[PDB]
Design a protein around this nucleic acid. Structure first.
Ligand SMILES: Nc1nc2c(ncn2[C@@H]2O[C@H](COP(=O)(O)OP(=O)(O)O)[C@@H](OP(=O)(O)OP(=O)(O)O)[C@H]2O)c(=O)[nH]1
Ligand SMILES: [Mg+2]
Lengths: 48, 201, 202
DNA sequence: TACCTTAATAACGCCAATAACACAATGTTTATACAGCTAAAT
DNA sequence: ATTTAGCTGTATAAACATTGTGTTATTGGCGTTATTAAGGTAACTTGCTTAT
């Protein structure tokens, strides 16, 4: 939920595509794995 | 997930633009086209007055532009056209209702081919007189909504509706009485938005 | 914090707002528009809307969105269905009642001056109620699993029609299943008037 | 400068449901290759 | 011409993707214990203090 009023749950996101209702969680996991790489992870590590 | 549309209809064009922002699967169907007479007859069976635009879904079928927009917002978690704050949402809803009653009804009446010259002239004059006030109110509401949340990345439906009304005013050939360069430049910038161009072309 | 509502006697929307406040269980101050000084009454609204409601920093005089605003402001049990499809259908049903209800109440109230004209309207209204009889059956308050705002809208019409001397329970067609149940809710039973009478009036 | 009582207020415990984790499992995606085809070669 | 090297093709393989499925977890709920407030009580002491 960034700039998102309701912080919609997985079911709402799955309905939004009309498909991939459980696929949304897998897509989020893949995105987290890609963003966890050092080139992006190292810069954001300083804040935490 | 099928929307019935009629060409040369302001409400239908606005619904199509809202779907384009969603980028959802919209199977546009033209009631006027003779290519799909059977589908138009099915729309008549489902809808008593055959109101257009009509959004059709297997679970339910809805009619009325405001109801259709609210239903689309509930259906999609895509960027919202409504404010996070309830008082702001209520004000936006009241403004949309006022704009629809004052201008949309006049546009629908002018659309008919049996219009009289006096009625058309009076409607055009009233629309020109209220256009500046409506635009000023919309800009003020947009600024107030933006102040509460920064970089929300949320698009306002009322601004899109005002842009569509201005485009219809240009198509009708009606003259806008604004002497301000700033207002003309802002209207041109709204007309130049890329997402709006896809429906217009 | 403190919220007050201004209402006009014999107004269906004002009754609907009062019922919604009772369901929300939020304490509020209710003031009759007539009691207020006429110049003071004009000052609150230049157009003059009897049902608006009162807040310290905000005022709403629009009945069409007033119920929706009241529901959004309070996070108490909602008057709208949780399911998205039911929520969409309920709004369409509310629009259907709002779009064409002027003839049912306004025309009879003012247009039907003749006693026969009121009688002529009554027969048509009874036939329309019978046609509505072949509709939802066994619904708790309507096409929803839980109490809904639309059920509140029906209460205002039922009380207003009863004030019009048109009371139908077993003569209103097969809609008796939900009519008795609606009065059961505490908020709905506030339409009209030894220790019990005094305590109730207090 | 007492008590407490009972009652009540407010904390707290427990329990449903549950959204979300989690894995599964495939069917997809991906990448792969190695391969018959193709470009260049000759 | 011939083939040869070039090209990766798309199946396949692998990886992903999707689906499903399990899990759990937390909200709600209920009751629950900590707490708490008020009422009541009646020898007698019936114009004060309070102060550079
Ligand atoms: N063609 C068309 N017209 C639309 C659409 N949406 C609204 N309208 C018209 O615009 C007018 C404003 O409607 P609303 O604002 O929704 O209802 P309101 O009259 O209570 O304000 C109405 O005229 P009205 O005479 O009040 O309508 P009715 O309610 O009396 O039938 C309605 O018929 C649409 O999608 N397509
Ligand atoms: Mg109307």
């Amino acid at each position: 939920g960034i700039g998102m009023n309701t912080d919609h749950t997985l079911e709402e996101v799955g309905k939004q595509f009309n498909v991939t209702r459980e696929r949304i969680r897998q897509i989020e996991a893949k995105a987290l794995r890609k963003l966890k790489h050092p080139s992006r992870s190292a810069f954001l590590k300083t804040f935490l | 997930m099928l929307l019935y549309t009629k060409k040369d209809d302001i409400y239908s064009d606005i619904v199509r633009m809202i779907l384009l922002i969603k980028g959802a699967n919209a199977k546009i169907v033209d009631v006027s086209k003779e290519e799909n007479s059977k589908h138009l007859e099915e729309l008549n069976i489902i809808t008593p007055n055959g109101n257009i635009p009509t959004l059709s879904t297997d679970d339910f079928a809805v009619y009325r532009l405001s109801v259709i927009i609210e239903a689309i917002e509930d259906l999609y978690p895509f960027p919202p056209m409504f404010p996070v704050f309830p008082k702001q949402r209520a004000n936006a809803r009241i403004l949309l209702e006022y704009v629809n009653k004052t201008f949309l009804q006049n546009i629908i009446k002018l659309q008919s081919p049996d219009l009289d010259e006096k009625q058309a002239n009076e409607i055009k004059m009233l629309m020109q007189r209220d256009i500046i006030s409506t635009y000023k109110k919309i800009v003020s509401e947009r600024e107030v909504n933006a102040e509460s949340n920064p970089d929300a990345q949320n698009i306002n439906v009322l601004t899109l509706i005002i842009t569509f009304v201005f485009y219809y005013f240009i198509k009708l050939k009606i003259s806008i009485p604004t002497k301000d360069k700033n207002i003309i430049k802002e209207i041109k910038e709204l007309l130049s938005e890329p997402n709006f161009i896809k429906t217009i072309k | 914090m403190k919220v007050t509502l201004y209402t006009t006697k014999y107004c269906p929307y004002s009754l609907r707002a009062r019922i919604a406040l009772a369901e929300k269980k939020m304490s509020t101050d209710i003031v009759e528009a007539g009691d207020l000084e006429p110049a003071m009454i004009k000052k609150i609204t230049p157009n003059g809307v009897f049902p608006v409601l009162m807040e310290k920093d905000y005022s709403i005089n629009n009945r069409k969105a007033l119920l929706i605003y009241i529901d959004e402001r309070f996070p108490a049990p909602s008057l709208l269905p949780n399911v998205v499809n039911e929520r969409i259908k309920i709004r369409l049903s509310l629009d259907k009642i709002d779009n064409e209800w002027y003839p049912v109440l306004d025309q009879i109230r003012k247009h039907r001056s003749d006693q026969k004209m009121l009688e002529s309207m009554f027969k048509d209204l009874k036939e329309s109620l019978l046609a509505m009889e072949k509709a939802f059956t066994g619904s708790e308050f309507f096409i929803s699993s839980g109490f809904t705002l639309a059920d509140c809208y029906i209460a205002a019409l039922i009380i207003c029609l009863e004030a019009e001397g048109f009371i139908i329970d077993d003569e209103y067609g097969a809609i008796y299943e939900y009519k008795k149940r609606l009065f059961a809710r505490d908020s709905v039973k506030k339409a009209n008037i030894l220790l019990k009478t005094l305590r109730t009036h207090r």
